[PDB]
Design a protein around this ligand. Sequence first.
Ligand SMILES: Nc1nc2c(ncn2[C@@H]2O[C@H](COP(=O)(O)OP(=O)(O)OP(=O)(O)O)[C@@H](O)[C@H]2O)c(=O)[nH]1
Ligand SMILES: [Mg+2]
Lengths: 517, 215, 205
Amino acid sequence: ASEDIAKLAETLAKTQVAGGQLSFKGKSLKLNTAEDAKDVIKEIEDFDSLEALRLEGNTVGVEAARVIAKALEKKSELKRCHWSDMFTGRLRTEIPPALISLGEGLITAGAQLVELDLSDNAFGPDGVQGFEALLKSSACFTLQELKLNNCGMGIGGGKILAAALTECHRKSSAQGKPLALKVFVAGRNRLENDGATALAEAFRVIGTLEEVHMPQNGINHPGITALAQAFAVNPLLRVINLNDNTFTEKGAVAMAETLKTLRQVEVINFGDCLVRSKGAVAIADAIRGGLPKLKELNLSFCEIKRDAALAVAEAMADKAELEKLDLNGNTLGEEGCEQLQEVLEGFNMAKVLASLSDDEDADVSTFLAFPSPEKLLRLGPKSSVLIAQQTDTSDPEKVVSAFLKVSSVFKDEATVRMAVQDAVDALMQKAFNSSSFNSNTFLTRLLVHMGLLKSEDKVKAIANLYGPLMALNHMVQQDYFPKALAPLLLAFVTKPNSALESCSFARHSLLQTLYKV
Amino acid sequence: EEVLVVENDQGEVVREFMKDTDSINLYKNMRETLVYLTHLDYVDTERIMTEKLHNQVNGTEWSWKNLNTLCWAIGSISGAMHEEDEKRFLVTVIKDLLGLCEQKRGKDNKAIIASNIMYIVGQYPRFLRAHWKFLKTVVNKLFEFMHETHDGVQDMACDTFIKIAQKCRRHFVQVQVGEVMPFIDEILNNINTIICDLQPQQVHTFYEAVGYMIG
Amino acid sequence: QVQFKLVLVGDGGTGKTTFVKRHLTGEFEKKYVATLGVEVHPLVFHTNRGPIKFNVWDTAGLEKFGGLRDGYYIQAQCAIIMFDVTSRVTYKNVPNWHRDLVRVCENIPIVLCGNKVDIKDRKVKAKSIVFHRKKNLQYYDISAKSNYNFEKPFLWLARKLIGDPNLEFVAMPALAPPEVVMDPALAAQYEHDLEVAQTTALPDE
Ligand SMILES: Nc1nc2c(ncn2[C@@H]2O[C@H](COP(=O)(O)OP(=O)(O)OP(=O)(O)O)[C@@H](O)[C@H]2O)c(=O)[nH]1
Ligand SMILES: [Mg+2]
């Protein structure tokens, strides 16, 4: 969006390292008393050269307003004042007084007010009366931008503002330096028809306008025709933003009539204007008739139909510097979007249009069979010797099988692990105290079953070694465990193997225990 | 950059830019790593930089070194995004930095913020070449900083100006849209008013920068 | 008695003050006089469960958001977010108002009211109103001019607060007037008003 970069350049052009803008934006100061504004006045006084004052996001009361006006009396080089939203929370009895006091302070100071912004302040006719005195006075003969967006003026406020603008123009022309307004932003004020016509009359006097924003003013066609006639006089118009009004069809025809005679318009925002597919054709004809330098054109949510959309697209394609076209929201058929894309890509741009994303048209053996952690508990303390007694310890193969079955259900739960460890201790104590029992055979079979070693007859290994490794770690620390089997376990546990890297913690703990002995 | 003030055998203090030291190598390695990572995913890098910038404006993490580091990181990833993504990211970053410049009080804080803005601008010549109004505004702002007596502002202006002149030398000689004359003619016509407050070496740098636009 | 602090929030020019005035007096303020700050209006309703009072804090829609106006929302118990049916720009701000409300008062009955449904050129349509589905809101079309569903929001809020789904308004506890009293000192003045009353036409459209 070229508007974003233009605004960025404008903001960059007015940044200084010293002697420049003074700001209080985003401080939420509640200047509810004269003393409460001591810091603000002290800071304002201590400023060499002042050329801008921002009071955004604050709450200026009557007393604070008087104090700030008295402070401003000194500053004579002031040229801009962005007072957007500096009365949040004040009632009707406190806004006009503060605004009049600030206006008097600026007038007596002798400023020039190249810009005057009062956006987002709830003024209405009362606030308009409040700052009319400032607007008429000599402080606004050089005024070049007047932003009143969202002031909520209304019909009466619009009439008063138009009268003030006309009087200011008359006085300025009498002096010798006629008022030359360039940017006028009065949106969201409900200037429906009387305010709109009054401001159109005010514009007709001033031929210097370049931008004019009136979005969301509830304007209907009877006022939009007068506004278009007023625009026709101004030959330097560059941006015509009238988003979210009601033109129906007469308004669009009236606007096309003036667009025919304007040769410098660059932005035309008519979104939500209910053009209804006939004013779309009229605007298409007007732009086709010749309107160079056009960069943007918005007709979104105008209830345009397919044929009118194609006509406007064809008319627009001839433009050279086109940079954005919006038609989202129109009642274009799904094939209509494809046809529009084809028509546009027939030209060079092929992508200028905005996205059309919205359109319409005894049991020890039983446990040993399938060991489970819970089944071990049910045996109670009997499990200590029942497992040892039942198992045949004469042959090391059965001892190893019993050890593996017991340790398979090993879990970190405190109760289960203690039962498993005492059962293992009893089983090995009965196993190791047997003359007809070779320990090395037991170790070799244990390694074979765990998969750490290979065997003549390939006995299928086990899946998880966590339980067996934990049981071994516990066993290594008991007395009955021979001090001669430590090296074999160490060698085959440090032995690389995929089945071991799965359980790194048990392997590491076992290795630490082995290196202890 | 690594700038060292060195006096030669004739007692003439000059600013030398060390080129192939260890610190420059460290910065180049970090820039390469960050550019690779941004190519892998630019949205995440943009999010990280945006979050850090937001932490700077709200003041919960404000610091000169933190802002300098953030701006060096932003300038290191120039050219690692598509043109439109880079344009949007730059608009956001520069708008936020400009908003922070007015917020902070004092001449030193504003000088630091302006120096960082100019460093970021000079590291994205594609953005400047794409848009002429912004480039002209930046050049005029640099010319305004050349009358600033605050320490380190004129040097920053001269460095940024020479960078912009080297990278975008072809947009000054040619006539742009809406301009009746080339910008180089405007610079040459009023050149005694631009270098009036500069020290001799800064004047030499300015003459070099203008020369890059005449070749 | 029973009081339910209600907060009426919505963009400028939507009909909050007109809605409240039509409820408490029955008139129709067709002039747009922007509300400054906040205005407290008590509305007394009578239901089958007794009388209730809504303290409607009609807030100003022209102000910005933020904490500067959080004073309005403190200790709130129900909210009416009002947007203008004949303006999409006003509908785009409903999410902002809902966010601002839920920032201060987390869980409260919030009613979305689409005003000005009597105008023929309608921009926002029943199909495009999808915000209330994402959250848990009740959406109602109202018209302070033609009196179309102009008490449904209060009825729904009362139903959700009192806790009786089958609550509905009863007629009134209206009793006979105390007594006829007149002051002859000002009586003549009254007659003068009648002499002017016959010389003006009713606001008939
Ligand atoms: N046609 C029509 N117009 C309405 C209807 N309701 C309200 N309006 C108009 O909308 C305007 C709303 O004015 P207010 O209610 O006083 O202003 P507000 O709603 O409080 O807006 P703020 O004061 O800025 O918060 C009135 O001037 C009416 O003309 C309606 O039901 N139909
Ligand atoms: Mg109001």
